[PDB]
Amino acid sequence: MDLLAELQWRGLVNQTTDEDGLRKLLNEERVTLYCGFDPTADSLHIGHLATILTMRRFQQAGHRPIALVGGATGLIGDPSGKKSERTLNAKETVEAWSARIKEQLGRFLDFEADGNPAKIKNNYDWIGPLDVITFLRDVGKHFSVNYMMAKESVQSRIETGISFTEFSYMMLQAYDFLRLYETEGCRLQIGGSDQWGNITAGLELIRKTKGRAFGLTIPLVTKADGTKFGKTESGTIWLDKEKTSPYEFYQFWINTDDRDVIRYLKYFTFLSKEEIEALEQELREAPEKRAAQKTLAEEVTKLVHGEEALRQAIRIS
Amino acid sequence: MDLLAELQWRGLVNQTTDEDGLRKLLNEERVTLYCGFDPTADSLHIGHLATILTMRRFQQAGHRPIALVGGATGLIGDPSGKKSERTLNAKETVEAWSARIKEQLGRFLDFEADGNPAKIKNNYDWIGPLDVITFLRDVGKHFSVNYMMAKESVQSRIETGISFTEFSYMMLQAYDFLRLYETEGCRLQIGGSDQWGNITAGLELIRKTKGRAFGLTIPLVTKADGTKFGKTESGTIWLDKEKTSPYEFYQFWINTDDRDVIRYLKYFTFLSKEEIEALEQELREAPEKRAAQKTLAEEVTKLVHGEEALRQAIRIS
Ligand SMILES: Nc1ncnc2c1ncn2[C@@H]1O[C@H](COP(=O)([O-])OC[C@@H](N)Cc2ccc(O)cc2)[C@@H](O)[C@H]1O
């Protein structure tokens, strides 16, 4: 209803399976949603914050988030939004990394709330031990090759080339949504733009096994200059303060271009509309002041790292 | 060398991966070959005898056959030579059926020979317990979707439609050839016409994992009238004497059309060339006698059922 309008307004809704459908339910019930995380590194990064912060926002309007760590799938590899086939990582690496991601994840969610506290889960627990035969019959039977072949993630790669391994990724992710629906009452799966195919894939698995649930994608982060967001010359801007220091984190935000700043405040912060509009007026009336740029930077650094870190960054700058 | 020439002559060689390559090895070593059987019913049928009898022939020239029972794959379903998607059978049914097939299989092979006795094996033993993750990474990584999509079995079905389940069948079969190569020194996989794709699939898995082995397909059984061999008005001609009695079996063969008879003697019998040519002359000189028709029928009934059964059929007719 209004949470969906806010998101809309903030510009956090790229697509939704059935908006009137979802808006209805969001307003009538406490909705369990998940979002999936693949240990693709030893740290999450600012590409992951929109989705992370969106969960929070869903939590704050009283809904319950399951941060999902991908111990099994990050063992497979999601072709989505990748032009090339990736390298398969070792179980040990993935295992190692899973533990960290779980840690960064837990900072953004509320585990003490009563009625809607998070859960952080690992699909390795239900993927780990499912036998091949069972997967192909139980899950595979439900998907035609041609449904699968039409996915943006796949269609985008067939001449490029794609391992059968990567080709089946969507099936796992598919399966995830089903276990979470069955065991946790999970009705919404949200994600970034590139994840739409894998979300619907899960809705196709649910419909076909039960015959109820939604999908919402967040747009990928835009730049007015047409360059790739978060891609600095120094390299990725991590969430691990040992990977990217609080000062560096801080400075990244402080260097937001006038063109981006109101979009980023909307995406990454908890300032109200009334506050954001106010900053918009000051960016117009006094853009050398850099009022919106400091508010963004303070707000986000506090979120990720906390006041002391913030206090340090500011004092260091 | 000469075994391959014989087969050639008999007309049992539709295709071979590398004939000079295989001919060489067949003449220089004791070759381990397998042939795969899917419990698709509670009995094998005369569609299966060419392949079965071919193994025997390979055994007789001193080679070692592994009759393979498909407890796992017949749980999946091979699209090959099927225009439509099949129904998935119960584990229990497949399990039940596996036991019978193993029994009919064992009749055609020599288990007492020293140096080249058969083995009857079940891919359920190595497929049964392989986890999904392991399969997609260990086996899937090696095959592009586009290699797979070009297979006769698959390409022949995409508009028709094909479950991902059936789409992956070739991967299992793929895997089979690899375990058998690794654990049994198996270098040749033979099969019927429709199996070429799945054979090569296994050679692609071997090359790519090791960097040696061959594939030979037997033609599907021809009729001069253009109808489907073994398809009677009474229904399938089984190998189970409780499904098709010895008399019925016998009569089926005895009703061979003049057009087929020399081809069938070549395919299903152990008569020499000199003998087959002799019968060819008598079919020419005296075709009302039905000399080739009785020799076929006697020879084959003895093979499948034994003399007493034969004696009965003849006395019953
Ligand atoms: N700039 C950005 N803007 C917005 N979102 C961004 C950006 N960068 C990354 N993301 C997102 O952050 C999440 C990270 O997912 P992933 O590791 O990349 O794979 C995703 C999935 N395969 C993991 C998964 C595994 C199992 C499962 O059940 C569900 C999901 C995704 O929703 C992705 O859309």
Ligand SMILES: Nc1ncnc2c1ncn2[C@@H]1O[C@H](COP(=O)([O-])OC[C@@H](N)Cc2ccc(O)cc2)[C@@H](O)[C@H]1O
């Ligand atoms: N008229 C006929 N002429 C000649 N051959 C015929 C005829 N009718 C049936 N066959 C053959 O007999 C064998 C029976 O195999 P299948 O049950 O039908 O599936 C075949 C495979 N999916 C089973 C398998 C499973 C696992 C594995 O590793 C290998 C193979 C095959 O080689 C097939 O080609």
